Write an enzyme that holds these catalytic residues in place. Sequence first.
Site, PDB file in Angstrom:
ATOM      1  CG  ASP A   5      18.043 -26.757 -36.603  1.00 13.64           C
ATOM      2  OD1 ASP A   5      18.386 -27.873 -36.171  1.00 13.64           O
ATOM      3  OD2 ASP A   5      18.348 -25.688 -36.047  1.00 13.64           O
ATOM      4  NE  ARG A  31      19.877 -30.687 -40.092  1.00 10.24           N
ATOM      5  CZ  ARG A  31      19.881 -30.065 -38.917  1.00 10.24           C
ATOM      6  NH1 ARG A  31      18.751 -29.895 -38.242  1.00 10.24           N
ATOM      7  NH2 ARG A  31      21.024 -29.608 -38.420  1.00 10.24           N
ATOM      8  CG  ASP A  80      17.853 -26.037 -32.596  1.00 10.93           C
ATOM      9  OD1 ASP A  80      17.921 -27.144 -33.174  1.00 10.93           O
ATOM     10  OD2 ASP A  80      18.679 -25.124 -32.764  1.00 10.93           O
ATOM     11  NE  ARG A  94      20.749 -25.783 -40.859  1.00 11.11           N
ATOM     12  CZ  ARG A  94      21.216 -25.922 -39.621  1.00 11.11           C
ATOM     13  NH1 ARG A  94      20.380 -26.000 -38.589  1.00 11.11           N
ATOM     14  NH2 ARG A  94      22.526 -25.984 -39.417  1.00 11.11           N
TER      15      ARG A  94
HETATM   16  N1  LIG Z   1      17.954 -28.241 -26.931  1.00  8.35           N
HETATM   17  C1  LIG Z   1      18.253 -29.032 -27.981  1.00  8.35           C
HETATM   18  N2  LIG Z   1      17.415 -29.128 -29.043  1.00  8.35           N
HETATM   19  C2  LIG Z   1      17.790 -29.930 -30.053  1.00  8.35           C
HETATM   20  N3  LIG Z   1      18.879 -30.690 -30.198  1.00  8.35           N
HETATM   21  C3  LIG Z   1      19.687 -30.571 -29.137  1.00  8.35           C
HETATM   22  C4  LIG Z   1      19.442 -29.786 -28.023  1.00  8.35           C
HETATM   23  N4  LIG Z   1      20.467 -29.883 -27.082  1.00  8.35           N
HETATM   24  C5  LIG Z   1      21.319 -30.726 -27.635  1.00  8.35           C
HETATM   25  N5  LIG Z   1      20.911 -31.169 -28.865  1.00  8.35           N
HETATM   26  C6  LIG Z   1      21.693 -32.067 -29.696  1.00  8.35           C
HETATM   27  O1  LIG Z   1      22.191 -31.338 -30.826  1.00  8.35           O
HETATM   28  C7  LIG Z   1      22.608 -32.384 -31.737  1.00  8.35           C
HETATM   29  C8  LIG Z   1      22.935 -31.775 -33.073  1.00  8.35           C
HETATM   30  O2  LIG Z   1      21.747 -31.146 -33.591  1.00  8.35           O
HETATM   31  P1  LIG Z   1      21.903 -30.221 -34.888  1.00  8.35           P
HETATM   32  O3  LIG Z   1      20.488 -29.880 -35.212  1.00  8.35           O
HETATM   33  O4  LIG Z   1      22.674 -30.940 -35.942  1.00  8.35           O
HETATM   34  C9  LIG Z   1      22.802 -28.758 -34.359  1.00  8.35           C
HETATM   35  P2  LIG Z   1      22.180 -27.276 -35.160  1.00  8.35           P
HETATM   36  O5  LIG Z   1      20.797 -26.975 -34.635  1.00  8.35           O
HETATM   37  O6  LIG Z   1      22.358 -27.374 -36.645  1.00  8.35           O
HETATM   38  O7  LIG Z   1      23.150 -26.126 -34.616  1.00  8.35           O
HETATM   39  P3  LIG Z   1      22.932 -25.176 -33.297  1.00  8.35           P
HETATM   40  O8  LIG Z   1      22.717 -26.092 -32.117  1.00  8.35           O
HETATM   41  O9  LIG Z   1      24.215 -24.364 -33.229  1.00  8.35           O
HETATM   42  O10 LIG Z   1      21.741 -24.290 -33.533  1.00  8.35           O
HETATM   43  C10 LIG Z   1      21.428 -33.362 -31.695  1.00  8.35           C
HETATM   44  O11 LIG Z   1      21.715 -34.661 -32.123  1.00  8.35           O
HETATM   45  C11 LIG Z   1      20.942 -33.259 -30.262  1.00  8.35           C
HETATM   46  O12 LIG Z   1      21.308 -34.442 -29.523  1.00  8.35           O
HETATM   47  N1  LIG Z   2      19.857 -17.154 -39.754  1.00  7.35           N
HETATM   48  C1  LIG Z   2      20.105 -18.400 -39.240  1.00  7.35           C
HETATM   49  N2  LIG Z   2      21.341 -18.864 -39.251  1.00  7.35           N
HETATM   50  C2  LIG Z   2      21.623 -20.055 -38.736  1.00  7.35           C
HETATM   51  C3  LIG Z   2      20.609 -20.847 -38.174  1.00  7.35           C
HETATM   52  C4  LIG Z   2      19.292 -20.336 -38.171  1.00  7.35           C
HETATM   53  O1  LIG Z   2      18.363 -20.984 -37.708  1.00  7.35           O
HETATM   54  N3  LIG Z   2      19.076 -19.115 -38.710  1.00  7.35           N
HETATM   55  N4  LIG Z   2      20.919 -22.051 -37.605  1.00  7.35           N
HETATM   56  C5  LIG Z   2      22.090 -22.579 -37.737  1.00  7.35           C
HETATM   57  C6  LIG Z   2      22.420 -23.899 -37.093  1.00  7.35           C
HETATM   58  O2  LIG Z   2      21.243 -24.486 -36.538  1.00  7.35           O
HETATM   59  C7  LIG Z   2      23.102 -21.997 -38.685  1.00  7.35           C
HETATM   60  N5  LIG Z   2      22.916 -20.541 -38.750  1.00  7.35           N
HETATM   61 MG   LIG Z   3      19.284 -28.363 -34.310  1.00  6.96          MG
HETATM   62 MG   LIG Z   4      19.937 -24.942 -34.608  1.00  7.96          MG
END
Ligand SMILES: Nc1ncnc2c1ncn2[C@@H]1O[C@H](COP(=O)(O)CP(=O)(O)OP(=O)(O)O)[C@@H](O)[C@H]1O
Ligand SMILES: Nc1nc2c(c(=O)[nH]1)N=C(CO)CN2
Ligand SMILES: [Mg+2]
Ligand SMILES: [Mg+2]
Length: 158
Positions: free
Chosen positions: A95, A82, A97, A92
Site C-alpha cells: 500500500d 496488490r 499512500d 495487502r
Molecule cells: N493520497 C492518496 N494516496 C493514495 N491513494 C489515494 C489518495 N487519495 C485518494 N486515493 C484513492 O484511494 C483509492 C483506494 O486506495 P486503497 O489503497 O485501496 C485505500 P487504503 O490505503 O487501503 O486505505 P486508507 O486510505 O484508509 O489508508 C485509490 O484508488 C485512490 O484513487
Molecule cells: N497497522 C496498520 N494498519 C492498517 C494500515 C497500515 O498501514 N498499518 N493500513 C490500512 C489500510 O491502508 C489498514 N490498517
Molecule cells: Mg492506499
Molecule cells: Mg492506506
Amino acid sequence: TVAYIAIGSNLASPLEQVNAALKALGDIPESHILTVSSFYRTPPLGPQDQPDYLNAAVALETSLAPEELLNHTQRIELQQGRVRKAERWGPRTLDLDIMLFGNEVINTERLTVPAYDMKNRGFMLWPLFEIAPELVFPDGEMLRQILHTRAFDKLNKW
Ligand SMILES: Nc1ncnc2c1ncn2[C@@H]1O[C@H](COP(=O)(O)CP(=O)(O)OP(=O)(O)O)[C@@H](O)[C@H]1O
Ligand SMILES: Nc1nc2c(c(=O)[nH]1)N=C(CO)CN2
Ligand SMILES: [Mg+2]
Ligand SMILES: [Mg+2]
Ligand SMILES: [Cl-]
C-alpha cells in the site's frame, strides 16, 4: 516537489515487499528518493484477523503531476500483487499512500491530499516525523505538535 509517501505491507513477506517498493519508487520517471524512514512493526488498524504491518515513509522528489505520481504508485502496488478485497482496512501486499505532495491541497475523486486519515495514525505520523521533523502541514499545523497533542504510542522496529 517533495512528496511524502506512506508504505504499508502485511502479506507475502512485508520486508521483501517494502524493499521492492523502495527500489521501484526510485525508478519512477522524473523522480528520486530523498530520505527513507526505519521499518516499523505495527498491529493492524481495523479487522484483527490479519497479520501485523510493516510501516515506513519515504520522501520522493518529483516533477510529475500528483495524479501521474498516483498512476505510478498504483502501478507499483499492482506489480507487487496488490489485490483489493471487499472488506475495508483488510490485508495487502503493498500500500503506497501519498501523504503530502509538497504543500499542496488536493481534492479530486481519485486523490485527496493531505491523506485523509494520516493525522489520526501513529503508523503514518511517526515514520514521517523520523524523516521530516520540521514538517508543517498545509493548514499550518506542525507535525511535531500534532504528535505532542495526540500522544500516540511510539512504534517498535520491524
Ligand atoms: N493520497 C492518496 N494516496 C493514495 N491513494 C489515494 C489518495 N487519495 C485518494 N486515493 C484513492 O484511494 C483509492 C483506494 O486506495 P486503497 O489503497 O485501496 C485505500 P487504503 O490505503 O487501503 O486505505 P486508507 O486510505 O484508509 O489508508 C485509490 O484508488 C485512490 O484513487
Ligand atoms: N497497522 C496498520 N494498519 C492498517 C494500515 C497500515 O498501514 N498499518 N493500513 C490500512 C489500510 O491502508 C489498514 N490498517
Ligand atoms: Mg492506499
Ligand atoms: Mg492506506
Ligand atoms: Cl493540513
